[model samples]
Target: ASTVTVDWDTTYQTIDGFGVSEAFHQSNNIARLGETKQNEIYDLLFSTTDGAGFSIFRSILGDGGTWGNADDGPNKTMQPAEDVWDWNESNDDQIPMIRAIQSKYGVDQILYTVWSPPAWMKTNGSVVGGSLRTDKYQAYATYLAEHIKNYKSKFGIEITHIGIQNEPNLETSYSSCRWSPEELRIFMRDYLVPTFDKENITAKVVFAENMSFNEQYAINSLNDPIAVKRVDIVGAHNYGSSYIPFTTTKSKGKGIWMTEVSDMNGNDTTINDGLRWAKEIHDFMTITEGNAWFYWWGACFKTYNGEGLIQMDLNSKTYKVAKRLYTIGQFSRFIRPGWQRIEATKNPVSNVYVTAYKDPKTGKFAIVAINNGWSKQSITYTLKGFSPASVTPYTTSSTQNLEKGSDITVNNSSFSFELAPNSITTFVGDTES
Candidate 1:
C-alpha cells in the first residue's frame, strides 16, 4: 500500500449554491431590469442538465426591483417594484424570475440574500449611498419577515438564510451603503431578530456580508455581542481577496460560509486557482468547523460582465461554459448532497490539494485533488480508518477544459498517479473495508 493516511469529516456543512444577482438576472422582468437574453447562459444555473448542480441561489432584491430599468450605478431616483409585496401583499411582481426557477428546479437547498432595501426606506430616500434609517428599522425588518412568510404562503418556498446588508463597510460609488459594525449589531439584535421572532420565521440571520478584509475589521465585526448570540452564519464575499481567514475566525456560534466567490475582470478563472481555493476552503472548514460555498460571480451571462461562469452572447442568446465551472462540478457532481468530508493528507512533493468525502449510503470514500505545479508530479492517495479498496480516478487538467465530464478508470487497493501541470482531479469508488 502507498504510505499515507487520509481521514474523513462527516460533519462538514453542505452547499447552498453558486450564484449571481441582477447584474446577471437575465429573466423577463423588464419593468425593473432591462433586456439581456443569454439562453444556455442560465442552464449552468437554473437547469440540472450539466454535471454542475447549484443547490443554493443568491437572488437579489435590487434597489429598483424591476428588470427593464438600467442599473443606474448607485443614484437611481425611482426604485423598482420590490415594495409591491408590501404595497399589495403580492409576491408575483417582485420575484417572478425566482419563482420560475424555484418551480422548475425545486427549492430544497435554496438560500436567498438581498443587496439593498427599498429606495424610500433608506436615509437618502434613494437606493444608493444611504443608511437604513432608525425609524424605518421595524418596517424594513418587518418587510423581510413578510417577504419570507409570503414566499412560503404563496410559493411554498422557504428561504433558509439571509444577510442583513451587503458590504455595509464600503461606501460604494455604485448601489451601496456604509454602516459601522456596532450599528449592524444593533440592527441585528434590536430590529432583525424581533421581527423574525414576531413573525415566527425559522430562517437564519447571517452577518458580515463584506467579501474580504484584514484581521482587524473581520474581528471587529464578529466580536459584537449580538452577533455572538443571534447570527447563524458568517457570510463573506470573494472580491479578489483571500477568504481562508473566514474559516479561522474565533467566533464559535457562527459558521463561515463563503457566501460569495465568483469570476471578475474578464480574467480566465484558472482551474488550478479554483482547486487551490477549494482545498484552502476545505482546510478552513476542518480547522474552523464551517461550510464552503463558492459563489460563481454569475454562472452564465452575456455582455462580458468580466465575471460570468460562462461568456454568453447577448445577441444570439448562446452560452459557453468555462473550465473552472467543471472544476467545481467535479466535486459537486460526485459528492452527494448528504456526504461527509474527511481529512485527507497530501504528499509534499506532489503539489496537489485535496478534499475528501464519504457517502454514508455506500460507505464509499472519495477524494478530490488538484495538481497546480508547472511539472507533472506523482502522488499516492492513502486511505486509512475506512473500508473497501476499489477506488477509481476522474480528472481534469491544464491541457483539458472541464466542460466535458471526468475521465474515469478502475483501480484496486491504493490509487496512485502523476498529474499534468495546472490540473484539478478527483478519485472515487470505495475505501478499505
Candidate 2:
C-alpha cells in the first residue's frame, strides 16, 4: 500500500482555464452539422455534468482570405484598402457559436490571436510568410484595438486576452510572421501598449506565441524593464521535445499559458494514449506550473489524420471522440478557473502520480492520480488541515469514461481505495463547515 498526503494551505499557480482552439475554421465543421449533432457536440464540450465544460474559447484574428472556403481560411476584417472595414469579415460561423457558448454556458473567457497581419503590413506583402514591417507598427496596433472594441459592440463577447502573433520564431506554409525578441518587445512596449491605453481597451496583452516553449524565446522580453511592466501573459506552444518552466516569467509575476499542443500522428483512440495526455498535463501542473492549458482543436474532420479530441464526419453527420477528451476531463471538468494547485505527494509509489487542486472560495478539493503500473495497487490519501467524511471517486480506464464509483469512507482524516492499472482517477471532496 502507498500513502499520499495533500496540504491545502500550500498553493501554487491559479488556473485561468482549460480549452482548445477553434482556429483554422473548426467552427465551420461545427456549423455544417445538423441541429441535433451540433447540440450534442456543444454538450460534449461545455457541459459540466455530461461534458468537459472547457471554459475558454480561442480564435484566430483573420487576415485576407475566403472565410467559408476550406482551402482559403479566415478573411481579413479590413478589405480593399487599409481604410475600409468589414464588420462581417471571417466569423460568420465562429461568432454565432461563440455567442451561444457564452450566453448558454457562461464560458465568458475569450482570447483572440493573430496568425499574420494583412499583406500591406508585411515585408513580403503576402499573408503566408513574412515579417511585419516596422513602419506599420502604429497602424497595426490601432487595427487590433478596433477589433478588440468591436468584439463587445458587435458580438457581445468580451475579449479577455489578446495574443500578438502566433509562432513568431518561424514562418510557415500557412499564415505566419517572424519577429525576433527585440522586435516583439519594441512592438509591445512602444506600439501596442500605447495604442490600447489610447483606445481604452480592457483586454490583457498576451505576448509572443513561441512555438517551441523555450525560455530563451521569451527571456529577453521578460528581462526588459519596459516590456515586462506592460505585458500580462506569455503565450506559448508546447511543441518542444522537453518541458521546462519559464523562470524569468515567474520572477516577473506574469502568467505562463500553454496555449497549444497536440499529436498530429493520426487518430489515436486508445486509453494508453489518453494516459499519455494525462501525464503531459500532470507535468504541466506539477512541473511547469502552467496557469492554463489548451489543446490544438476541440473538434476536427480528419484534416490532420483526425488528431482532434472530438472527430466528426461532415459527409456522414456522425461524430466520435478519442479517449484523450475524457483524460483531459480528469482535470478540466473538476478544476474551475480560479482554483489553485496545492501541495500533494505527487509520487507516493512507482508508476502512480498524483496532484491536488483546491477552490479556496468554497473549500472544495480534487485529487487526481495516474496509475500506470502493471497491476492494481491499493492506495490511501491523507488530508491535512481539511476534512471530509468521504470522497467521490471517478475513474477513467480502458473500459471507463470518468465512471463514477461508490464514495469511499474517510477514516481518521484519510481514505483508502484500489486504483486500476493503466488508468486515471480523481477523488473529489470538501472541508467541513
| Predicted model with the maximum lDDT | 2
Which residues of candidate 1, in runs, are more than 4 Å off?
A: 1-4, 9-24, 27-43, 46-49, 65-107, 213-227, 246-251, 269-289, 300-306, 399-413, 430-433
Tell me the lDDT of candidate 1.
Answer: 0.57
Which TM-score value belongs to model 2? 0.96
Q: How much is 168 displaced in model 2, in angstroms?
A: 0.8
Runs off by more than 4 Å, candidate 2: 66-68, 78-80, 89-92, 303-306
Candidate that would win on TM-score: 2
lDDT of 2 at 430: 82
Global local distance difference test of model 2: 0.82
Per residue, candidate 2 scores C-alpha lDDT tens digits across 1-433 of 9999999789999999898877777787877887878888888888877887888878888787432467236645544357887777344457778888888788888888888888888899887788989999988898789888987887676888898889998888878899988888788779887788888888987777888876566777788777676578888887755468888888999898888888877566878878888888898888889888888788877644535788878888788888888888889889989999999998889899999999989988999999977889888889988878889988899999888889888887889888999999999888856
